[PDB]
Amino acid sequence: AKAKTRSSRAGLQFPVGRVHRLLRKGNYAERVGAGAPVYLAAVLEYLTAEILELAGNAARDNKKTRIIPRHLQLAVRNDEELNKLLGRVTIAQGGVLPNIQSVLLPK
Template identity: 60%
Template sequence: MVRKSKSFRAGVIFPVARFKRYLKQSQPAFRISDSSAIYMSSVIEYLVAEIIELSGNAAKDNKKVRIIPRHIQLAVKHDHELGKLFENVTIAQGGVLPSIHSALLPQKSKQKDLESQDF
């Protein structure tokens, strides 16, 4: 009989047994079922896949082949749901989103607008 891991049987890549061990360590008074560890590992796997996909698109937009923390920052902040999830998270070496406050933009003068309308 060939031994199969819990991750293999559940069809996920992330380690189910390790998640179960960490859940047991965090709350030693509670019983932890296998299905809770499977659910947690599948949710974490989905989030990581989503972040990696969006970060890869950001890297491709910047004509790079490697994903750096800046690409992760751009991907997370441009996605509404991930932005909400990561709103209080600081990504090291991520930088800031490129934006210019409207008060800092040059104002159009009314004189130039009036001159351009007189044809």
């Protein structure tokens, strides 16, 4: 009846009711305990907070107040657990980080 999303109920921004609609519509199990959408969208909000910090951080480190994908590369890949977590996940136009090989560089 009253359309009121669960993101304020859990303190999030991501629509946990869209999460529950997609959860019942994801057929992961028949009974879909609605706390499982919240356990999803909570980690969504928490890791979006984890990543937008780093993205704007690398942006402002590149003197930028808009996150470009190069800043996403410098955000994720410099983090050891993000690169350990996203070993095969890529950011388009993130580019490359500056690193010359050791005996290639003169000593």
